[PDB]
Design a protein around this motif. Structure first.
Motif, PDB file in Angstrom:
ATOM      1  N   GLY A 142    -121.782 -37.754 -15.046  1.00 51.16           N
ATOM      2  CA  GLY A 142    -122.670 -37.392 -16.144  1.00 51.16           C
ATOM      3  C   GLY A 142    -123.304 -36.048 -15.851  1.00 51.16           C
ATOM      4  N   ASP A 167    -116.953 -35.695 -21.433  1.00 52.70           N
ATOM      5  CA  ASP A 167    -116.929 -34.576 -22.369  1.00 52.70           C
ATOM      6  C   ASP A 167    -116.327 -33.376 -21.635  1.00 52.70           C
ATOM      7  OD1 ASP A 167    -117.486 -32.388 -23.999  1.00 52.70           O
ATOM      8  OD2 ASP A 167    -119.524 -33.046 -24.483  1.00 52.70           O
ATOM      9  N   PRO A 199    -125.422 -42.846 -20.530  1.00 49.03           N
ATOM     10  CA  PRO A 199    -125.891 -44.016 -21.261  1.00 49.03           C
ATOM     11  C   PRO A 199    -124.852 -45.150 -21.358  1.00 49.03           C
ATOM     12  CG  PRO A 199    -125.305 -42.269 -22.815  1.00 49.03           C
ATOM     13  CD  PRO A 199    -124.940 -41.782 -21.435  1.00 49.03           C
ATOM     14  N   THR A 203    -119.150 -46.772 -15.374  1.00 48.89           N
ATOM     15  CA  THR A 203    -118.756 -45.368 -15.237  1.00 48.89           C
ATOM     16  C   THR A 203    -118.353 -44.985 -13.811  1.00 48.89           C
ATOM     17  OG1 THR A 203    -121.053 -44.748 -14.856  1.00 48.89           O
ATOM     18  CG2 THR A 203    -120.243 -44.661 -17.116  1.00 48.89           C
ATOM     19  N   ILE A 220    -128.800 -45.903 -18.305  1.00 45.04           N
ATOM     20  CA  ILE A 220    -129.039 -47.213 -18.899  1.00 45.04           C
ATOM     21  C   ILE A 220    -127.919 -47.481 -19.915  1.00 45.04           C
ATOM     22  CG2 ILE A 220    -130.692 -48.650 -20.142  1.00 45.04           C
ATOM     23  CD1 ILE A 220    -132.823 -46.389 -19.404  1.00 45.04           C
ATOM     24  N   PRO A 240    -136.400 -47.718 -15.046  1.00 44.09           N
ATOM     25  CA  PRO A 240    -136.294 -47.250 -16.437  1.00 44.09           C
ATOM     26  C   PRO A 240    -137.106 -46.009 -16.857  1.00 44.09           C
ATOM     27  CG  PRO A 240    -136.751 -49.633 -16.322  1.00 44.09           C
ATOM     28  CD  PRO A 240    -137.011 -49.061 -14.968  1.00 44.09           C
TER      29      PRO A 240
HETATM   30  N1  LIG Z   1    -134.554 -43.948 -16.051  1.00 41.13           N
HETATM   31  C1  LIG Z   1    -135.206 -42.896 -16.566  1.00 41.13           C
HETATM   32  O1  LIG Z   1    -136.341 -42.644 -16.185  1.00 41.13           O
HETATM   33  C2  LIG Z   1    -134.537 -41.987 -17.568  1.00 41.13           C
HETATM   34  C3  LIG Z   1    -135.186 -40.681 -17.962  1.00 41.13           C
HETATM   35  C4  LIG Z   1    -134.377 -39.910 -18.903  1.00 41.13           C
HETATM   36  C5  LIG Z   1    -133.159 -40.370 -19.387  1.00 41.13           C
HETATM   37  N2  LIG Z   1    -132.671 -41.558 -19.012  1.00 41.13           N
HETATM   38  C6  LIG Z   1    -131.379 -42.063 -19.471  1.00 41.13           C
HETATM   39  O2  LIG Z   1    -130.368 -41.400 -18.704  1.00 41.13           O
HETATM   40  C7  LIG Z   1    -129.153 -41.325 -19.461  1.00 41.13           C
HETATM   41  C8  LIG Z   1    -128.674 -39.879 -19.538  1.00 41.13           C
HETATM   42  O3  LIG Z   1    -129.503 -39.113 -20.402  1.00 41.13           O
HETATM   43  P1  LIG Z   1    -129.094 -37.620 -20.821  1.00 41.13           P
HETATM   44  O4  LIG Z   1    -130.218 -37.022 -21.614  1.00 41.13           O
HETATM   45  O5  LIG Z   1    -128.503 -36.876 -19.646  1.00 41.13           O
HETATM   46  O6  LIG Z   1    -127.928 -37.972 -21.879  1.00 41.13           O
HETATM   47  P2  LIG Z   1    -126.840 -36.881 -22.347  1.00 41.13           P
HETATM   48  O7  LIG Z   1    -126.207 -37.384 -23.610  1.00 41.13           O
HETATM   49  O8  LIG Z   1    -127.409 -35.497 -22.285  1.00 41.13           O
HETATM   50  O9  LIG Z   1    -125.792 -36.954 -21.142  1.00 41.13           O
HETATM   51  C9  LIG Z   1    -125.007 -38.114 -20.940  1.00 41.13           C
HETATM   52  C10 LIG Z   1    -123.631 -37.645 -20.513  1.00 41.13           C
HETATM   53  O10 LIG Z   1    -122.875 -38.739 -20.032  1.00 41.13           O
HETATM   54  C11 LIG Z   1    -121.520 -38.443 -20.311  1.00 41.13           C
HETATM   55  N3  LIG Z   1    -120.703 -39.664 -20.203  1.00 41.13           N
HETATM   56  C12 LIG Z   1    -120.659 -40.704 -21.053  1.00 41.13           C
HETATM   57  N4  LIG Z   1    -119.777 -41.637 -20.615  1.00 41.13           N
HETATM   58  C13 LIG Z   1    -119.250 -41.180 -19.465  1.00 41.13           C
HETATM   59  C14 LIG Z   1    -118.264 -41.651 -18.475  1.00 41.13           C
HETATM   60  N5  LIG Z   1    -117.660 -42.836 -18.652  1.00 41.13           N
HETATM   61  N6  LIG Z   1    -117.999 -40.874 -17.398  1.00 41.13           N
HETATM   62  C15 LIG Z   1    -118.604 -39.684 -17.221  1.00 41.13           C
HETATM   63  N7  LIG Z   1    -119.508 -39.193 -18.087  1.00 41.13           N
HETATM   64  C16 LIG Z   1    -119.866 -39.882 -19.198  1.00 41.13           C
HETATM   65  C17 LIG Z   1    -121.532 -37.815 -21.695  1.00 41.13           C
HETATM   66  O11 LIG Z   1    -120.371 -37.009 -21.953  1.00 41.13           O
HETATM   67  C18 LIG Z   1    -122.826 -37.018 -21.644  1.00 41.13           C
HETATM   68  O12 LIG Z   1    -122.584 -35.648 -21.347  1.00 41.13           O
HETATM   69  C19 LIG Z   1    -129.482 -41.966 -20.803  1.00 41.13           C
HETATM   70  O13 LIG Z   1    -129.118 -43.351 -20.716  1.00 41.13           O
HETATM   71  C20 LIG Z   1    -130.986 -41.860 -20.924  1.00 41.13           C
HETATM   72  O14 LIG Z   1    -131.513 -42.883 -21.764  1.00 41.13           O
HETATM   73  C21 LIG Z   1    -133.315 -42.334 -18.125  1.00 41.13           C
END
Ligand SMILES: NC(=O)c1ccc[n+]([C@@H]2O[C@H](COP(=O)([O-])OP(=O)(O)OC[C@H]3O[C@@H](n4cnc5c(N)ncnc54)[C@H](O)[C@@H]3O)[C@@H](O)[C@H]2O)c1
Ligand SMILES: NCCCC[C@@H](N)C(=O)NCCC[C@H](N)C(=O)O
Ligand SMILES: [Mg+2]
Ligand code: NA
Length: 253
Positions: A142, A167, A199, A203, A220, A240
């Motif tokens: 990711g 992507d 998300p 993975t 998540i 989370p």
């Molecule tokens: N735990 C926390 O405190 C916290 C804080 C912020 C975000 N998040 C979560 O973290 C996650 C990521 O957020 P983000 O803003 O970077 O999202 P984002 O959409 O910017 O990035 C997610 C990336 O994951 C990639 N992806 C999807 N499936 C995949 C796979 N099978 N293999 C490899 N890559 C894959 C997508 O192409 C995308 O670029 C989300 O679930 C968000 O809700 C959690």
């Protein structure tokens, strides 16, 4: 309003994460933050402002910030009226979020933080401080808004960073722009350190896992099933909201 189960889960998850982070790195979440940013807390007054652009988000932040020792409060009013209320009531740091941006703004020194890079950076930092690592190979799965700044942080600490994102266009830009090695998920290479930020479930391929490897993930739902986690005794760091929030607050102190 948090249900009683919601309140209990926040503290439970935080304590679980504190222990896991201590086990993996030898420091707790607060210890990681202080070392990361070179800052310390003085129980700064943190005003949390609900935004109607509403469930328990504000209430969850209140519990989280209290856990980390901050003098926090949730404003009665939302939005611009809440902001006014927070500043008028002596907030030194404002915490608020719409669907696109979750920020901390320290009105005293003018430093402002975005949850996304702050989360990627701290989870990457945790992963990078694995004591029993015995390799500087790290897999990043990711490379979005959380993943990319995490990868960048691992490069800046001179790790050997492998990266994959489903992507293609994004993978290309990440591989050219910070010297991460494109990883093919059909590469049978085992890693003892993995940082995941997607998300999506499932993975991390099984072939990538080693015994007792660290999996540091804000993503998540969970990046691996419970089956693979137990089968490889994965040291999971996953929570989370709180860890990223701590990262935001310490980064603006
Ligand atoms: N735990 C926390 O405190 C916290 C804080 C912020 C975000 N998040 C979560 O973290 C996650 C990521 O957020 P983000 O803003 O970077 O999202 P984002 O959409 O910017 O990035 C997610 C990336 O994951 C990639 N992806 C999807 N499936 C995949 C796979 N099978 N293999 C490899 N890559 C894959 C997508 O192409 C995308 O670029 C989300 O679930 C968000 O809700 C959690
Ligand atoms: N996975 C956690 C990352 C943040 C997700 C993001 N989409 C989000 O829900 N932001 C918070 C919105 C908060 C809402 N405006 C409120 O104040 O109640
Ligand atoms: Mg978190
Ligand atoms: Na995930």
């Amino acid at each position: 309003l948090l249900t009683p189960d919601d309140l209990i889960n926040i503290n439970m998850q935080l304590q679980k994460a504190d222990s896991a982070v201590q086990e993996v790195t030898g420091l707790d979440i607060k210890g990681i933050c202080k070392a990361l940013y070179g800052t310390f807390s003085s129980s700064e007054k943190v005003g949390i402002v609900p935004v109607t652009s509403i469930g328990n988000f504000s209430a969850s932040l209140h519990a989280i910030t209290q856990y980390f020792g901050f003098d926090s409060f949730v404003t009665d009013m939302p939005d611009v009226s809440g902001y006014y209320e927070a500043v008028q009531n002596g907030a030194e740091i404002i915490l608020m979020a719409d669907d696109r941006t979750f920020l901390a703004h320290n009105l005293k020194n003018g430093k402002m933080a975005n949850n996304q890079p702050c989360t990627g950076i701290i989870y990457a930092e945790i992963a990078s401080r694995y004591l029993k690592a015995d390799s500087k190979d790290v897999l990043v799965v990711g490379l979005g808004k959380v993943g990319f700044p995490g990868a960048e942080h691992l490069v800046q600490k001179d790790f050997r960073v492998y990266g994959y994102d489903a992507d293609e266009t994004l993978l290309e830009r990440a591989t050219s722009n910070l010297g991460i090695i494109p990883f093919d998920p059909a590469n049978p290479k085992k890693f003892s350190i993995i940082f995941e930020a997607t998300p999506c479930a499932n993975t991390i391929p099984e072939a990538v896992l080693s015994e007792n490897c660290v999996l540091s993930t804000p993503g998540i739902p969970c990046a691996i099933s419970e089956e693979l986690r137990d089968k490889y005794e994965v040291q999971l760091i996953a929570e989370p909201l709180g860890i990223g929030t701590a990262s935001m607050l310490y980064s603006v102190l």
